[PDB]
């Protein structure tokens, strides 16, 4: 858009009837624990992991 | 001349000395190592094999 000069006329916005179709997506991740170190009380792990 | 108080004072002085020394110790393992605390009989930690 830009300031337009009078010539005895009017100019409406130009662009119309168009799109881009971004088509948003999704992402994910997952981690495990192995259920073993819980008994050993080695809970020091999984702090820096998270 | 020699009393347990002097020994305790020397112990505290040495404690402060090497505590200050260790607090300023250069760190190089943290660049390529991961710190993991443990409490007792820690031999398995199953974050491996997960990518």
Author numbering:
A (entry chain L): 54 to 103
B (entry chain a): 3 to 53
Provide the authors' own sentences about this structure as they appear in the paper.
Bacteriophage Casadabanvirus JBD30, from the order Caudoviricetes, is a temperate phage that infects the bacterium Pseudomonas aeruginosa. The virion of bacteriophage JBD30 is composed of an icosahedral capsid, long flexible non-contractile tail, and a baseplate. Using its baseplate, JBD30 attaches to Pseudomonas aeruginosa via the bacterial type IV pilus, whose subsequent retraction brings the phage to the bacterial cell surface.
The heads of tailed phages assemble as procapsids. The sample of JBD30 used for the collection of electron micrographs contained a fraction of procapsids, which enabled their structure determination. The procapsid of JBD30 has thicker walls and is more spherical than the mature capsid. The hexamers, built from the major capsid proteins, in the procapsid are compressed and skewed, as was observed in the procapsids of other phages. The diameter of the procapsid is 556 Å, which is 6.8% smaller than the diameter of the mature capsid (596 Å). Pores along the central axes of the pentamers (15 Å diameter) and hexamers (13 Å diameter) are wide enough to enable the escape of scaffolding proteins from the procapsid. No decoration proteins are present at the procapsid surface, since the binding sites for the minor capsid proteins are not formed because the arrangement of major capsid proteins differs from that of the mature head. The expansion of the procapsid into a mature capsid is enabled by conformational changes to the major capsid protein. During capsid maturation the N-terminal arm (residues 6–25), which is an α-helix in the procapsid, extends, unfolds, and rotates ~40° anti-clockwise.
